[PDB]
RNA sequence: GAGCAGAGUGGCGCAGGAGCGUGCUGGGCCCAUAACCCAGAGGCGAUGGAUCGAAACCAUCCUCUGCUACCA
RNA sequence: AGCAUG
RNA sequence: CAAAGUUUCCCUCAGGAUAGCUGGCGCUCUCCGCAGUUUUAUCCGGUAAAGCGAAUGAUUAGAGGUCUUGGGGCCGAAACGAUCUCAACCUAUUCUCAAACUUUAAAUGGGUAAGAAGCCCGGCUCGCUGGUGUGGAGCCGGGCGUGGAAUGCGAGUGCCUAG
RNA sequence: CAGGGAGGACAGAAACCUCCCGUGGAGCAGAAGGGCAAAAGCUCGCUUGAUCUUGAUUUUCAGUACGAAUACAGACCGUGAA
RNA sequence: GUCUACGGCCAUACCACCCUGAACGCGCCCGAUCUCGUCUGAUCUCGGAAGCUAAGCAGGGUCGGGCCUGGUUAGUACUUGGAUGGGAGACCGCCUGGGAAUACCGGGUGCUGUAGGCUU
């Protein structure tokens, strides 16, 4: 088997959408900063929804992306929290999957009352060597048709690497 | 008291009664409207042309 | 009364041909234009600078002044009962060379060549162009098979 | 379902970019702004210094644009530096400087202005620009073609530019993107540029890495160890390379070789061939259907 | 209370459709163009009959609806309730304008939309009937009765094609047997020899 | 026909970041009803568009109300 | 100071 | 000899100025040049026509699909488990259109050229441009007449000027 | 870019995150038309060529003027490695 | 035969899927000390050479979609000039010249300039 077809985690994307701006949003940013080990960035609201209580250009969410050994260890913590239990539909047809967590203390981080309780949103994107030509500058190209990752391949990789279980539905 | 507004009825005959004459042409044309820098150099060249006369004649 | 706008009625005149929008090819900029050349005017909508007036579009002029990005060209314009030869400034994009003069240049070069030839030899050579001469007498061979008979078909209403 | 976007109408109204843009090779905005000669210059050539950094070498060319295609008057590659002594490191700042200098000297030797306009024999790192001397033929002038590369501070295209400037071409530039310009303070020191030209940053890396961990040192430098070049030899060997390039800048072509004319690809199939292929497929399918 | 059709029976003005410039147009009187048994396969209605126009003029939606009603009534009476098929092949898109008086005169005399008419050319089909081969005289008589509701001259002509298709009746069975034609309801689909042969083998298996 | 004004809680009305007096419902005082007192519920004529956001802005319509349609 | 009715 | 009710401006529309159409007086040449014409080359265009199995905007009709949603339901607590379905949706087709739509695209037509003011050599000037008496332009000297499509015809130019 | 598809705790028809398709189906102050995709759009950094001056030309046209525009030339500047 | 650097004409070069790639090369690929830039060395910049044709890329293929060029549609539609032609008209025919476009049916699927390589 060719070595350059091995699946790998390009990056793990974490975000918390608190839905408003100010001290709670800063607290959530501190949550995921202490979780990962890098300063996050704030996302703004693009429209204005009176029922949701968000206005245009209002900072309502915070997100970060982790790559490498830190990504794999944080994903391991998240899947340990979710006891390696994913549905069949949790996997995107393009080769990715993700899940959420309703309480972030379960990850194994100390609670400090000046921060509180927040829920996370995990989303990993699987890779394959040579994917960087799609986003490189000088001679950009596609990534081929055989070289692409499918839902079945992502599921099989998950269940053989994290020796997990996939429940239908 | 309305009257006619616009017309070009008899105009072609009025024009070809004396004929449609093409613009008059001459061998040499005026040097107006051309680049001032290029004119300045041309004038300098004409002014100093005199000093190669002996070599030209020889 | 219509308006006196500078681009009135140019909707299709200054529009790009089908599947030919976008970046301008570089050979047009890379052409060189001496003074006295004959030039065909054609406006191109991609570039809005140095655009000729719509009355000169489709006309042919003569270069008299070459500049950084444009050329001064003398064109003939007919107004009422007189023709004025007036000077305009047109950018290089709206300009192409004319092959009408190139044909005559090739012919004159060949004419001088054919004059210097067949002159030491003493023979006479035609140089002028004569109009399409009437067909000379010729035979038509019906070798075997005979011309088939053609008669009009009966009418019927196809549709 | 979902409405298909790429259908017959889409394909028959599609309009493709230029071939070079499709392959990603060129940037036509800068191309037009950089290669076009002014009209009253009347086909006077306008020159470019192309600097392209590849994964394994550096390409430097001097060219001017013509309608039939770009005409290249001189070319100097980094892979011919082993002739002059540089064995390894053919894609660093020092190699970029050396190949630029080689291109400049080769062009000067071609044009016969190589004795005049010696440039910087002893590199000092700071700004220099050749000044055309009166009486003698004027200095050669060209411009930098950076391509699609990000022209940020400390770039090998600017290293090649400095090499060519020391060689003796009059390329307009500023000492703001040379490695050594400190943005937060807005001055430029030349000794750091000299270190980058001579490979002292690479040498310091080797010292540091072999001091910390020999496994990582060997992994990061294996052909270096093979060509037994140490951190204490790089300044001397790069100076020798500069001197050799300034000595013998001419290029001698590799001799042409006989060909046995062996095709490695597949020729295009013919009309009757594919028609009878379709006929065979139909016959076989009908035979199986009957069977 | 509309003007006699002789006021609007000639193709005098440029084609003038209901668009974002012409608004406020009342809807046409004819809203159904296909009727009879239109769920019938192409196999069972071979005979076709047309009402070919003989003048370049305009036909009103009211006239089109009246002729449609007359033809349907006679066909129902004669060929049974669902033994035929009628297709009106004219759609009124040209809208006519009326300058309503009562005293401004001809000052600002541009009319408002009144109704819609259809511009027709020489040899352009107005109506078509698709039915059994035995009902030829019934079709001819139905078209003859529908003729009187239209101004100008028209003529009844029996088409050489098969049903409401563009393929000749004599060769229709040959071609459908030889598998160039795939029936697809009212009409038929012509199968060329230029696609991928996967479709060819799918048809042949 | 042209100009013009006006459509909003059951009825009459106010009005760029849905309400009034009256009506209605529940409970109080009274032998009981109204009056009086305490609470509550109830909805921008239609369409499209400018706008971060409109019942309010801009056009077209569905009604209704008023003013002119003179001179011989 | 307001206080109608059966 | 011989017209005009046309262009632009004016508190102008029953009037003026202005250009156009006209006449008169001449003068510079003649006894190459010009043309309400064609031919040969070369460009220009978006009308007629045509098209909607191509974009935009209208538009009739049946077909094949699917779970993508909603419903009539029924079997079932139920269940994307399932039945007919009506539907929208997707896919090939089909009928009819567009002064303010278009991939196409005429006929008639609008510029330019058909040489002596043209070519081919030699040299000088330049403060412009310049890797390079490089590029371009201007100047002096010389050499080549089969006046390089058809047809027709004497041309040019200046004042004054009425209606 | 408009939009569409498949996923992710609250989160939903609509909040934010990720991948894929996406010839412009978006946007470029305003009416319409034309033009535009490593841009003419979106986001950043620096700035004031929206500055001083003589001529030539185009548009309406009488080949008058205003307005608007084009190609230069001479200063002094901005920006970019150029 | 074939590639790389810069290009010209900008689909005969595009798009979808499949097969093959000797050597060079182009690549993917290994790390952040230095220059440089990010929430993230993923992009960009930099220092390399353990591995690989899996991907880009090149050549070929599909009774492929598209594109290009032909035939048919068709001397049909339309149209210059003409008649004391027809017809109540709407319109039509003839004379004199020019002359298209879908559906349908074939064929083809990048040429090429400058400089530098590989094919001992
Ligand atoms: Mg008048
Ligand atoms: Mg750039
Ligand atoms: Mg009319
Ligand atoms: Mg006044
Ligand atoms: Mg009078
Ligand atoms: Mg038009
Ligand atoms: Mg038409
Ligand atoms: Mg840009
Ligand atoms: Mg990396
Ligand atoms: Mg590969
Ligand atoms: Mg492969
Ligand atoms: Mg094909
Ligand atoms: Mg080549
Ligand atoms: Mg061998």
Swiss-Prot record, chain A:
Cross-link Glycyl lysine isopeptide (Lys-Gly) (interchain with G-Cter in SUMO2), sequence positions = 30, 44, 146
Subcellular location(s): the record lists: Nucleus, Nucleolus; Cytoplasm
**A GO CC term assigned to this protein in UniProt:** cytoplasm
| GO MF entries | rRNA binding; structural constituent of ribosome
Q: Which biological process, per GO, is one annotated for this protein?
A: translation
Is RNA-binding among the key words of this record?
yes
Q: Name one Pfam family in it.
A: Ribosomal_L5_C
- Record's PANTHER family? 60S RIBOSOMAL PROTEIN L11-RELATED
Protein purpose: Component of the ribosome, a large ribonucleoprotein complex responsible for the synthesis of proteins in the cell. The small ribosomal subunit (SSU) binds messenger RNAs (mRNAs) and translates the encoded message by selecting cognate aminoacyl-transfer RNA (tRNA) molecules. The large subunit (LSU) contains the ribosomal catalytic site termed the peptidyl transferase center (PTC), which catalyzes the formation of peptide bonds, thereby polymerizing the amino acids delivered by tRNAs into a polypeptide chain.
Q: What's this protein's name? A: Large ribosomal subunit protein uL5
Organism of origin is Oryctolagus cuniculus (Rabbit)
UniProtKB/Swiss-Prot annotation, chain B:
Please give the organism.
Oryctolagus cuniculus
Record has Cytoplasm as a keyword: yes
Q: Report the main location listed first in the record.
A: cytoplasm
Assembly information from the UniProt record: Component of the large ribosomal subunit.
Q: Name one GO cellular component term.
A: cytosolic large ribosomal subunit
Q: Report if keyword Membrane is assigned.
A: no
Q: Which UniProt keywords apply?
A: Acetylation, Cytoplasm, Methylation, Phosphoprotein, Repeat, Ribonucleoprotein, Ribosomal protein
> Compositional bias of type Basic residues: which residue ranges?
1-25
What is one Gene Ontology biological process annotated in the Swiss-Prot or TrEMBL record?
cytoplasmic translation
Which Gene Ontology MF annotations are present?
structural constituent of ribosome
Please state where this protein is localized.
Answer: Cytoplasm
Region ranges (Disordered): 1-32
Q: What does this protein do?
A: Component of the large ribosomal subunit. The ribosome is a large ribonucleoprotein complex responsible for the synthesis of proteins in the cell.
Put simply, this protein is called Large ribosomal subunit protein eL29
Source organism, top-level taxon: Eukaryota
Q: Which residues carry this modification: Phosphoserine?
A: 30
Positions of modified residues (N6-acetyllysine): 32
Residue positions, PTM N6-methyllysine: 4
Indicate the family of this protein.
Belongs to the eukaryotic ribosomal protein eL29 family.
Curated annotation (Swiss-Prot), chain D:
Q: For the modification Phosphoserine, which residues carry it?
A: 183, 270
- The keyword DNA damage is annotated on this UniProt entry: no
Annotated Gene Ontology cellular components are:
cytoplasm; cytosolic large ribosomal subunit; nucleolus
One GO process term, biological-process aspect: ribosomal large subunit assembly
Source taxon at top rank: Eukaryota
Q: What is its main location?
A: cytoplasm
Gene3D superfamilies in UniProt: 3.30.420.100
Q: A Pfam family matched by this chain, by name? A: Ribosomal_L5e
Q: Where in the cell is it found?
A: Cytoplasm; Nucleus, Nucleolus
Q: Which positions carry the signal peptide feature in this UniProt record?
A: none
Look up the coiled coil feature and give its residue ranges.
Answer: none
Q: Which residues carry this modification: N6-acetyllysine?
A: 3, 46, 218
Task: Please explain the role this protein plays, according to its UniProt record.
Answer: Component of the ribosome, a large ribonucleoprotein complex responsible for the synthesis of proteins in the cell. The small ribosomal subunit (SSU) binds messenger RNAs (mRNAs) and translates the encoded message by selecting cognate aminoacyl-transfer RNA (tRNA) molecules. The large subunit (LSU) contains the ribosomal catalytic site termed the peptidyl transferase center (PTC), which catalyzes the formation of peptide bonds, thereby polymerizing the amino acids delivered by tRNAs into a polypeptide chain.
Q: Which family does it belong to?
A: Belongs to the universal ribosomal protein uL18 family.
Q: What is this protein called?
A: Large ribosomal subunit protein uL18
Swiss-Prot record, chain E:
Domain of life the protein comes from: Eukaryota
Mark the residues carrying the PTM Citrulline.
31
Q: Which InterPro entries match?
A: Ribosomal_uL16, Ribosomal_uL16_CS_euk_arc, Ribosomal_uL16_dom, Ribosomal_uL16_euk_arch, Ribosomal_uL16_sf
User: Which Gene3D superfamilies does this UniProt record tie to the protein?
Assistant: 3.30.60.300, Ribosomal protein L10e/L16
Q: Where in the cell is it found?
A: Cytoplasm
Q: Where is this cross-link: Glycyl lysine isopeptide (Lys-Gly) (interchain with G-Cter in ubiquitin)?
A: 179
Post-translational modification, briefly?
Answer: Citrullinated by PADI4. Ufmylated by UFL1.
Main location per the UniProt record: cytoplasm
Q: Where is this cross-link: Glycyl lysine isopeptide (Lys-Gly) (interchain with G-Cter in SUMO2)?
A: 166
The GO biological-process annotations, alphabetized, read as: regulation of translation; translation
Gene Ontology terms, MF aspect? structural constituent of ribosome
Q: Which GO terms describe its cellular component?
A: cytosolic large ribosomal subunit
Supply the alphabetized keyword list: Citrullination, Cytoplasm, Developmental protein, Isopeptide bond, Ribonucleoprotein, Ribosomal protein, Ubl conjugation
Q: Which Pfam families match?
A: Ribosomal_L16
**Keyword hit for Ubl conjugation:** yes
Q: What does this protein do?
A: Component of the large ribosomal subunit. Plays a role in the formation of actively translating ribosomes. May play a role in the embryonic brain development.
What does the subunit comment say?
Answer: Component of the large ribosomal subunit. Mature ribosomes consist of a small (40S) and a large (60S) subunit. The 40S subunit contains about 33 different proteins and 1 molecule of RNA (18S). The 60S subunit contains about 49 different proteins and 3 molecules of RNA (28S, 5.8S and 5S).
Q: Which NCBIfam families match?
A: PRK04199.1-4 (NF003239), uL16_euk_arch (TIGR00279)
* PANTHER family linked to this entry: 60S RIBOSOMAL PROTEIN L10
Q: What family does this belong to?
A: Belongs to the universal ribosomal protein uL16 family.
Protein known as: Large ribosomal subunit protein uL16
